[PDB]
Amino acid sequence: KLKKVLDKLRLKRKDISEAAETVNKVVERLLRRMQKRESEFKGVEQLNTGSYYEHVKISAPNEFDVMFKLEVPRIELQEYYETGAFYLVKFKRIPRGNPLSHFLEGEVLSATKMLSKFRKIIKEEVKEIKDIDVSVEKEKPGSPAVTLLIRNPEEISVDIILALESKGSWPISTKEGLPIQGWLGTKVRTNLRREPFYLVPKNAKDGNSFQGETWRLSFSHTEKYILNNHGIEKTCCESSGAKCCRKECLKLMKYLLEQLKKEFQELDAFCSYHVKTAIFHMWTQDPQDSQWDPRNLSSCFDKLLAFFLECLRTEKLDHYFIPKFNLFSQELIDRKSKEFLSKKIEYERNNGFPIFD
């Protein structure tokens, strides 16, 4: 039933091999340039994130997320209002001439300036690539990335995400977040929150004050770890352990939403991170690996489905790391959208999921 859908969604190792070849080449060139010519993004490091690197990419390997993170010492964050997600970045110490002085709009590190220079460098190096059909995509509003289109005959999109790495303790807005204590445990959560955190440009085009100096938190590293260490049992999905159907449900849900989005313009507010967040909450709700046995696929997928609908009905999907940040607020998504989606989803749920063809 659903197993056949999962077969359809499976990536093919040939496609994977070629796409990965080309992609790795381009990425390596860009990183190296970002170090080489006496840049100010020298010292940047690489961190692969997203569905492809979590092995939850569906249909095709045509989307890649790569973080160019740069450690930026001695900073102080001023929370942008009480959003929990958004911050203004200040420095204690302008070191001397300082790489990042040119990226200052006061005491405040400007996300848009930094992003513009980043973009300029990337375009420059991309012009010098003669053996691969790679180009720079026009800037998308609300993106912290420079998106590359690769004609590896087939089209592949690569988000090169500019990030700031901070080894300090996580902002307060996350203190109640990451509620894995009953699922992955206390030692795990403690070790994860000991890790650095990351800030990417918000790059909203709304016309606000502090619009180009607003940064958003990112936890793609931690999400990667969770996707790859997802059981209560350490042997879950391991070589000497047993498979769950967690990743599978994430894939099915992702696909459902992708299709429902390609057919309806009413769902342009929705992205797969909503699905991911919701499923994090579900995995925290049903921690037991037994509650995610393959033989219970259909029911498991329904459980999640049910949960999601409730999130729409209550208009309440809390951010998994920032509990005060609601993702289904009226400010971000209109009621009408959520209701429309509840309708379509319910239909599909009561009709044997016709859309899966």
Add this chain to the structure above:
Amino acid sequence: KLKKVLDKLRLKRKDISEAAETVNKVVERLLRRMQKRESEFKGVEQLNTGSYYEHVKISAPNEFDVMFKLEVPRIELQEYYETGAFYLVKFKRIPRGNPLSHFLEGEVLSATKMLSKFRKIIKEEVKEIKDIDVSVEKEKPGSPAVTLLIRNPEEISVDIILALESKGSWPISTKEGLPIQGWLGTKVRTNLRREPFYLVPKNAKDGNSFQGETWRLSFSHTEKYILNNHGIEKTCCESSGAKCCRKECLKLMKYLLEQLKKEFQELDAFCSYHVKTAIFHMWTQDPQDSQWDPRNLSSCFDKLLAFFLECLRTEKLDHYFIPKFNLFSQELIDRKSKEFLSKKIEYERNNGFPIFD
């Protein structure tokens, strides 16, 4: 029944507090001196091991194990025969004048010279302690340590173990060892074997060739990790998880052996590491946390007990990290001892464990 015995074996937080106070003071002074006066053990670091730091110490806090580990780059090991446990230590690179040149008997690092200088320094600093009654114990044959007796009114013994730290990949004799793949998992084992390993002086007084240049492997770091991360479930014994009776069975077994040893001279070959190794094998055999529920204490303790007897009957207790190394060989322990122990143990097992009074 056994719960009351575990109550008797429990340490008391006052005793713990005082003993720990004094002990930490002395240890800090010794480490600092080991760094300060222009030594050759400068750069040494501390690593607390053993029952006290695993929270499996029984009766009293009168025994402490502390490793002074020193990273020793660019070495090559020659396995002492096919023992798997014993090695001769050679250098690729005599760096220049080199700290450790004085500890060389050729190309071979001498364990006894190093241990002698270590001991000399420790005695020197111990003379300078005026506020605490601390002395150096006479060297024990087969010890890689300098043992301190502290009259903190009550007597406390502290083994200061000289160790060498190597970040290279683990010797081949351990390749089949650490068989946690079904219990803690594959990722765990892989990450643990990526860690450094340690060599302590064998310090046998047997009169062999290469007697004072023979080193023994140590895995007290890994054993510490296992004791503190002992479940298949990450929440085992955690604040938002459930208790097992693993540590409890280790304690009971430890105590049984301690008593049976204090009463009988026939069991001077036996140490608690045999108990620890056996229980590692049992935890690998019964990985499920459900197989270690508190309510199944008595039976669990019996299971272990049974296992141990079999190890004596077969005269086969493999080292947990070095599978080729047998601990119940005739070379190390006489049959008569193992049989005697089987007898006493069986008696206790069939008689409601009178010895526990």
Add this chain to the structure above:
DNA sequence: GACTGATCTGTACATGA
């Protein structure tokens, strides 16, 4: 500007209810 001691956060354990 770089190295060492001081401070802070949280887990495991004892204790009291």
Add this chain to the structure above:
DNA sequence: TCATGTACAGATCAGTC
């Protein structure tokens, strides 16, 4: 079984050369 206090452990921050 559930709340309160101590040790241990690791990490970050503040102070000295």
Add this chain to the structure above:
DNA sequence: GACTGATCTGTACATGA
């Protein structure tokens, strides 16, 4: 003598039986 590229081991995943 210090920094970067090359080599090696193992987990997760696709494929074939």
Add this chain to the structure above:
DNA sequence: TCATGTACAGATCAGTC
């Protein structure tokens, strides 16, 4: 469901300034 081959990831070692 179980054996074979590819990507990804981290670590150590060898080669260049």
